[PDB]
Each structure stands twice: as structure tokens, then as C-alpha cells.
Amino acid sequence: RLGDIDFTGVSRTRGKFVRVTSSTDPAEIYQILTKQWGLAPPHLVVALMGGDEVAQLKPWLRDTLRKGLVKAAQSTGAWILTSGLRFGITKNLGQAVRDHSLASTSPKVRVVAIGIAPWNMIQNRDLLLSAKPDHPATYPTEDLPYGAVYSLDCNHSHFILVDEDPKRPGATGEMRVKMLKHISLQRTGYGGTGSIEIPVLCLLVHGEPRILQKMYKNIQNSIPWLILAGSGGVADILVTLMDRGCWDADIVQELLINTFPDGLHSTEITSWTKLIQRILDHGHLLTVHDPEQDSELDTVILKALVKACKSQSQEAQDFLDALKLAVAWNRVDIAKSEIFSGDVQWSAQDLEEVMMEALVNDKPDFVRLFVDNG
Amino acid sequence: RILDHGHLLTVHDPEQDSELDTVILKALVKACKSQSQEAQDFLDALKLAVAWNRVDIAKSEIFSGDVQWSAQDLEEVMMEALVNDKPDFVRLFVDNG
Amino acid sequence: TFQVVQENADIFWKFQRYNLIVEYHSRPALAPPFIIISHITQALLSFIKDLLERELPSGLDQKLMTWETVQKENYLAKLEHEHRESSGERL
């Protein structure tokens, strides 16, 4: 069921949406996103996995995060997967995406804020139940309180509304995980000639213990994660344990109890402890972003992606996909530090396509680097 | 018994710091913070920090993680910063909800 | 006086040129003594019944406002960055 939404409020904007069930194949959803709605295959997918809690980020940290994310996404064509609900970090991030879209003089690269929200958490769903192809449904925007129901953000251009699964109350999370896994196995460009595998990345902002299962499932699907240093929720636990260097059951139990005193369930605490241990067992898929120190989100994104790929395999072909990504963002220093450091042998035939991409994309630093490297 | 308190004691070294107002504000906020952790207690200290246009001291001490600050909490302090020609505190309060 | 004035005289000429061009925008296309035809036509049209200073649709106006805000943010960020990389601040 596909329909268009005409938001009514301060700014009149038109947005698309589709109702989808938990039994749907993600291939169909990706196909309709790419073709039916005319969205080009993204060069970068960033998924927000938090910010819906009662506690919110500081306005300075929120603004830094939104500015860094938009700046990193504007280099190429990026998708920002969030819950299409006007609340928390999602509202401000969608507003920043919309502001960048209006102010972008080059429509060649587009930052699209996709919204995946549960159907039962939609305010005035009957208003959009019409979905007349000739007349798009009119939807009013209201800043509801925390509660348990929100209104769709008008700044998200496209939506993926998922119905609740009668089996388990995790339909939206499973759908998000499946969509991320399916997107991670696609090609960046229209054809598989000079196109790379789509880099899918997840961002954590003040997670709750309920999302640990979904985070571990994503890690099992082998997609990198970025953790905010000063987020507030599970992000603090993860960054503290990684700073400590080693994780033990007592330490993580104590930290989880201190950060979430309201959570008092022995089985739940043990399950969360096991989930955290298995999550940290990977490590190469985990990365810390500290806006106070680095504040360069694109640098952290590239470092996380190349770290994940390098941990995956040592073949030079694996780095070549990462090398193209490093070229695309004109981060020659990151490429020199990570890809071109001793271990990886690089033949002339290997660098032919990458040299073409650097030459035709007006990146002279990479041209010099490739000439200097055989 | 005097040193048992400690939070009420502060050292001023004119050779090193020589900024008496900074030491005074630090001592006052330290005493109040040791007294209680309620945000209302810091609000009286926040107004004092505003009055001396010491935005750095306020950011270091009052606005560091521990103390939750609601919009209704900052209304009067925002008024004081706005009407007293302190723009740094206006920026800080706008950035803080 | 010539040496002191020339630079300000150029700017003043540009400022005056704005007003003169605005003035020629509304002027009838027929030079006098012909201009009487234009005046009669204008009076008759008034009795019977602007490239500059234009009004834009709501969507375009909002887009331009957001674009100007983005440009202002970029300009302020550039100023802050150039101040941060200054020799004095580095020292």
C-alpha cells in the first residue's frame, strides 16, 4: 500500500510513505525505494538507533551531531535511516536534513531522511489511511509530548510504516535490521562497473537496554557502529568499558545498575550482561565518536568502515572498495594512514579503476598518491 | 575538625592565580554543591555566576553533566542574563534548552 | 584631494547609479517632446483602470530564507576557523 502525504503546518511539504508488514521481503522494499520513489542507490547509509528515550541530548551536543552528520552526508549521496517520528534527536536531525536540502544548489547528490516507524505509534493514522493516488492525504503536524505516540516528522521525505507483528512486539526493530542487512549487500552506483558495495553504518545515541538485542543482531550482520561519547544511555556503558580495556561480568553489571537503576530484573540483567559481552567481543565493529575532542564525523565514519573491512579480510580487493570510498570523500590522509601502510600490496592493474575515479572526480591528492604508488 | 569539612576551605595563591573573583566563585559553588545536589541550589549559584559575567566558571562547574536543567528552571536566569547585558550566558542558556 | 577622494568617489557613484537605474526603470520609453504621448496614454489607462522588488511564492521564499541561513552559518564557521588558525591564537 503506497500513498503520498501532504503535510499541513508551518511549511507545506509533500512526503511519500508505504505500509509494510513484518513478513515482507526487504528486496521489495528496497526495489520500491529505488525505483518507485526515484531514490538513487545511496553511497552511505546511516541508521539512528536511539534518541527516543525520555532523556535528551544537550542542545550543543545535538547541534554538533546534526551538523557533523549533515556535513559528512553532503559529500556523496547518503541516506539517514531514522524513526519517522517528530520527537527527540530525530526531529532536529530531520530539520537539519531538510534545511540542507533546501540550501543545496547541486541536486546531483541528495541527503534523504528515510523514516521507519511502527504503525501503532502513529498519531492520526486514519488521516493518512485514505492514500488516494489522485489526492495525497493531508496530515497535520503536532508537537506531542513524550507519551507513547508521536506524529510523523514533516522533514522526512520518505517513510516506511511497519505494522505490529502479532507474534512478538519487535516488528519495527526486526524490519530495520533486515533492511540494513539487505542494503549492505547492494551496489553504490546504477551499474556494477565502477560501483562499490553500499557502506551501511549505525549510530547510537542514548540507547536503552531494550535495544541491546537489536544492536547485537546488527553486529552479527557485520555492520559497523558509532557510539557517542556523551550520549547518556548504553553509549556511556560501551565507551566506559572500551576505555577500561577489558570487560567482566561484575563491572558491566555494576555499571548497568548505576546507569539504569530503574531496571531491576535478574533475568533481564543477566541477559543484558551477556548481550553486552557478546557485543564487545567483536570490537572491530565498534567505534567511539567524541564531539568534544574530534568533532569530525566523516573521519570517524571512514576510520570505522576501513577498520571493519580490514578486520573482515586482508585481501587487497577488500581494501579497494574502501579505497574508492576514501577517494570519494577526498580524505587522502585517512587513506594514506590506513589503506596505504605497508601491509597491502598494490599492483598497477589494481589501481587503474581507482586512478580513473580520482582523476575524473577532481581529486589531485589521490592522483599524486597513486602515481607515487606504482 | 576544621579540615574535616574541606569543602568550605579554599586556597588563594596571588603568585599563581591572582584572580580573586574566580577563586571566590569557585569556593561558593563548591560549598553549595557539597551542601546539596538539587538543581535549585545551583540556581542561586548560577545567578551569582551570571552577575559576574564568568561564563567559563559557570560552564565548568554548574553546567557539567550532573545537574539537569529544564526550560522553566532557566527562565528567570535567562531574564537576568538578558537584562544585564551578558551575551555569553544568553548563548549558553539558548544552547542548553 | 583627488588622491584622497577617488576611492570614495567610485563607491558614491555606484550608490548613485542604483537610484538612477531605479529611476530609469519607471520612466516612459519615449523621450520628450514625444513623452506627451506616453503621459496621455498613462492618464487614460489610469482613468479606465517591476523586475526589482518582486514578491515570491511561499515555497520559494522559505527555500531562500533557509538558503540564506545556511550561507550565514557557513560564513560564521569560516570566520571562526580563520580565527582559530590565526598566528596569535595558535601562539
UniProtKB/Swiss-Prot annotation, chain B:
Domain note: Contains two Ca(2+)-binding sites that are allosterically coupled. The binding site in the intracellular domain modulates the voltage dependence and the accessibility of Ca(2+) in the transmembrane domain.
Q: List ligand-binding residues for Ca(2+) 1.
A: C32, D41, D44, A45
Which species expresses this protein natively? Danio rerio
Where is the protein situated, by its record's location annotation? Cell membrane
What the record says about family reads:
Belongs to the transient receptor (TC 1.A.4) family. LTrpC subfamily. TRPM5 sub-subfamily.
Q: Which gene encodes it?
A: trpm5
Quaternary context: Homotetramer.
What name is this protein filed under?
Transient receptor potential cation channel subfamily M member 5
Q: What does this protein do?
A: Monovalent cation-selective ion channel activated by intracellular Ca(2+) in a voltage- and temperature-dependent manner. Mediates the transport of Na(+), K(+) and Cs(+) ions equally well. Activated directly by increase in intracellular Ca(2+), but is impermeable to it. The activation mechanism of TRPM5 involves a multistep process.
N-terminal signal peptide = none
